[PDB]
């Protein structure tokens, strides 16, 4: 059987830091499950055999790999622009 969750929860924001913190929390929840569900796809060894679920597990690597690499370099440049201006 399958099960989807229709209700998504939301909270009001008043300041600017919590808007930053929900991207911080939103990225931490994405990587903590997606590091694991592809390993659960790897540790279940019937999922590593069928070519259908092999090709989606092929591309799920690239979905995980390009995402974490984008938020690294954007933050590297983002903290790099604050570095140079205060050094002047």
């Amino acid at each position: 059987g399958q099960a989807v969750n229709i209700r998504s929860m939301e909270t009001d924001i008043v300041s600017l830091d919590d808007r930053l913190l929900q991207a911080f929390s939103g990225s931490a929840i994405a990587t903590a499950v997606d590091k694991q569900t592809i390993t659960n796809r790897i540790e279940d060894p019937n999922l590593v055999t069928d070519p259908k679920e092999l090709a989606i597990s092929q591309e799920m690597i690239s979905d995980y790999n390009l995402y974490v690499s984008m938020v690294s370099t954007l933050t590297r440049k983002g903290v790099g622009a604050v570095e140079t201006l205060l050094r002047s």
Partner: protein, 78 residues
């Protein structure tokens, strides 16, 4: 729980696609070995040995093809 993969199910379809050929090879040997001079038994035994030969050959070549597909993809992981 004894695990069974996808490669098990393709090879299991050869096992379930034929009903009792593992029995039929065994059954054809005992009737032939009791009296290896019956012409009715000789024509039946030529068919079953050759059927069991194509059975295992069809099993082994199919698994080799699906084996080479995954290894090209796993190499294409990194």
């Amino acid at each position: 729980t004894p695990w069974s993969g996808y490669l098990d199910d393709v090879s299991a379809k050869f096992d379930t696609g034929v009903d009792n050929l593992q029995t039929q090879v065994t059954e054809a040997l005992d009737k032939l070995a009791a009296k290896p001079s019956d012409p009715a038994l000789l024509a039946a035994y030529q068919s079953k040995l050759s059927e069991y030969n194509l059975y295992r050959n069809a099993q082994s070549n199919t698994v080799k093809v699906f084996k080479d597909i995954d290894a090209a993809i796993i190499q294409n992981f990194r």
